């Protein structure tokens, strides 16, 4: 039920610094605000210099930190330090015990402070691997034992999005574009489960409608819609969406190869 | 020295935006910060930016103030992070130029080397795209306009993608409309392939000088051709999986239609019945 | 491969710095050869034999040659021993001289033609559906 | 050369390692002592095994338990023991089709995930040919 | 208990099994009787994880156990199921057939319909983890001879109540059940055609009428 | 009133709350009449150790074996057993755990609760070791799992049956060839399943449609 909302600039600065430090792990701090018990919002990030030793407690640099703080004050960015990013390149997202102790050093600052692990290399143009969570593949380290996972979402202002739109100009390329497949897996599934759901509704309307007059039936059902029209209706989206879905791939395979 | 095309990463955009609404600066005023990237070669690759506190002199500013100590205090505090991002130039998000612009660029010539680049982010977006516009100053000394682009580095590829997952369009146009849009696209591609072919002819024949920057991109086009966990059966299993849904859906239409036949036949039976008397 | 192999025979006696490091030169050749034989090939896959004959390398090393070709960044891809294939996800962009372009012109003519036939072949079918 | 030797991804070949670094190693007092610290030389062998077996997991998609033994200079009980180890720590993803046959190192990808790969490949392709368009116009003007 | 008085257990499952929370005996019958009922219906229609949930875990039946001459027998059956004790299953099965079922004025009518079912489940449950297993393994387990075991499975298999199929030449048993997408393909093809031919059939009739 | 609550918390499986009671309740019978209550302070030391043995913590078990506290008087059948069973657990050598189910049972057979939690714990140990031996493998001839885990096949596949059937690791046993297959995910597809339901509901709806024949 608990969650964090990670603004775009945070996420991009994140992945940038991470990808830039490869193949060594980088750390930094997270600026935001705690809405309620159920939420942490992260609007900002700044990057913490390298250390001779690995990412660790003293890697956090007071001088550097406050030195950044005030200079953000002058920009009005004033926020708490709500968590700290990090990266475990190639190793997936989990906290080593050494990650843990530091996480505690951020518990005693604020009890709700969170840990964010980013994984630059295997995060790729598909799904981005990211994780945020706090203490008490990954189960080897006691995913649930010493600590526990959290959830993540992304705040987007209208204008933000509007900038992001113009990145790709798809106006020429449309029609060879194949939309995300997993999404049409939930599509082609939930659609079918639904058709099942209204099947026996159409069954009940044919039996009841059989033994009861139309004038009586209307009184009952006018509230909802004619389950025969959810068959007639719902069959379509599956039909044509799946025919363009098939054809599009049939073309990309033979044409593009 | 002389540079032509200007490249920009999306993070200066989002950054500068968050500077605008972070600082609540209304349109009659503007926002200002500086720009870090690579100015060396004959393009200019912008990557990172950070916000600069400044003041304009009441209305109709005769003077102004930028904090140079804030600059030379922040800069090296970036250099400790990624040393390879060098201070380049500044930006004001004000939709159109100001009088002191040409004056202060001359100041930034203190903290950079070649030709401090001034680009203008459009924070209102209310117009069409390319909220940026890129400018330099050449002699006299006015601002030469330059082209721009938004060049996603791999990290920004990943980010912008993962953030724009959901906004993707429904495109309710009927089946014929879609299937049309496609074949249009195919012909388009065909044409462009013409273009490249006879061009390459002009490279080995017309002796248009070798343009490496293109050849690189051709190569990158080959690197992306799917070899074709083999992807092949990865695709076959899908196409089977869709053809299922197509099929049982067809069953659903068929049974429906049959129903409507029942409604006709029953209907004509009772009508023709009544036509008796 | 062979032409280079001829060239080294003379100068290899001449310049003593070349006298040393002949091993390098040999490896480096085998590599470049490999890279090209992949770069031209329409569908990128190889048996180990193919690389052997192309590089005139006995096939045990062939997987050392491939693995080393990757660890320098030149290739990405995987090796399947059971069937003795090499998939080669992708091959590094590299500045191209004149002749090497021509083949690119070719393959691109092909992949122009395939589209010629497909696009021109899909109006006929489904002529009754257009808008 | 030692550190650079474990940074890079390549096969170690234990004997040559022992030969080369034998003297300089053995000379040191704490790490590789006369009879007291000899127990380090068994570790070093272990780390070597884990190294080669760690990289093969990178390149090879499949390999035959025989050839893998040959590459590691080990036996089958040994091999399967090391694979068992590394996979228990989740260092590598390898799954042994056991009856005297085949280690399989590919992380099996959900076919829809393979697709979402191949789409993006296609899209970035088209974007490139587009740029090649705008350029390919531009040069004639320029020239 | 009416629902139980007919073949319909599927209702008696929830009905009885929640009647354990509160029960009025002076109405009809003793609390241990209705215990035997809710436990029998429970055994009969409950899924393996909901058997453990709602019955094997009994704030009530635990409070009874030896209380009667049945619940110890029938529970001694159910535990022998849930816990995969195959050697013991049939003996307790016979027991309960004699001790609880046939004396119950409600159940006795249904006695056979129960036991037939309770055979299948075990056969089912025994195979579910095997894509092939050999008869003598099964017969050994249950402690019957092969020929009789084969003879028993032959009742269920052709009715597609059991997803096995037998190979007598080798004395082997392989399990074809709809899990791997393959099976869920074939079965779908067959069911689909079975719907078509019907649909067409009636189709021509209403066409010509 | 204490150790009985420790007992009920050995029924609810919280062993920290349990030892909370067992420690004190040991101390009482410790300092008390000792006439026959040397044995009633000999009883609780056990459950005190059951707590830890369940809790995997062998350090506090070392703490429990100290001469004066108990051993000085109480060196006896109790301690050797529950020790050997304890570090036998933390070593996870099942042959050891078994032999300590052999030669120490002179009490274990008598004390019901103890022996119970050792049968439980023994299970949840053998389970684990299995889950660790299989995952590097597919098509692993089951004799191999046996000799590795060091146990007779018949009860191995006796358990692997139970695990398959409990949804633990998603695989299937082929007894024809003596093989065990493992899978990564449920092999079955959900989509096709919902198709298989839809065809049914339809196949009824058709019949009911044609009933309208009239
Ligand atoms: Zn870490």
Numbering used by the authors:
A (entry chain G): 24 to 159, 186 to 306
B (entry chain E): 3 to 141, 151 to 239, 259 to 307
C (entry chain F): 263 to 393
D (entry chain B): 298 to 440
E (entry chain D): 216 to 424
F (entry chain C): 218 to 431
Can you provide the manuscript's text about this entry?
The eukaryotic 26S proteasome is a large multi-enzyme complex that functions as the primary degradation machinery for the selective turnover of aberrant or unneeded proteins within the cell. Docked on one side of the base is the lid subcomplex, which contains the deubiquitinating enzyme (DUB) Rpn11 that cleaves polyubiquitin chains from targeted substrates as an essential step in proteasomal substrate processing. The lid is an asymmetric, ~370 kDa complex that consists of 9 unique subunits (Rpn3, 5, 6, 7, 8, 9, 11, 12, Sem1) and exhibits a characteristic hand-shaped organization similar to that of the eukaryotic initiation factor 3 (eIF3) and the COP9 signalosome (CSN). Rpn11 is an Mpr1-Pad1 N-terminal (MPN)-domain containing metalloprotease of the JAB1/MPN/MOV34 (JAMM) family and forms a heterodimer with an enzymatically inactive MPN-subunit, Rpn8.
The C-terminal helices of all lid subunits (except Sem1) assemble into a well-defined helical bundle that is centrally positioned within the lid sub-complex, adjacent to the PCI horseshoe and the MPN heterodimer. Notably, within the isolated lid, the Rpn11/Rpn8 heterodimer is positioned in a previously unobserved orientation relative to the other subunits, stably associated within the palm of the hand-shaped complex via two primary interfaces with the tetratricopeptide repeat (TPR) domain of Rpn5 and the α-solenoid of Rpn9. Importantly, the N-terminal region of α-helix 13 in Rpn5 (residues 275–285) is nestled against the end of Rpn11’s catalytic groove, with several residues from Rpn5 directly contacting loops that surround Rpn11’s catalytic Zn2+ ion. Although Rpn5 Asn275 is not within range to directly bind the catalytic Zn2+ (~5 Å from the Zn2+ to Nδ1 of Asn275), the cryo-EM density in the Rpn11 active site shows connectivity between Asn275 and the catalytic Zn2+, potentially corresponding to a coordinated water molecule. While the Sst2 structure presents a snapshot of the transient substrate cleavage product prior to its departure from the active site, the positioning of Rpn5 Asn275 establishes a stable tetrahedral coordination of the Zn2+ ion via this catalytic water molecule, inhibiting isopeptidase activity of Rpn11 in the isolated lid sub-complex. Interestingly, in the context of the isolated lid, the Ins-1 loop appears to be locked in this closed state through interactions with the neighboring Rpn5 subunit. The combined effects of the tetrahedral coordination of the catalytic Zn2+ by Asn275, the steric hindrance imposed by Rpn5’s α-helix 13 in the Rpn11 catalytic groove, and the obstruction of the DUB active site by the Ins-1 loop result in robust DUB inhibition.
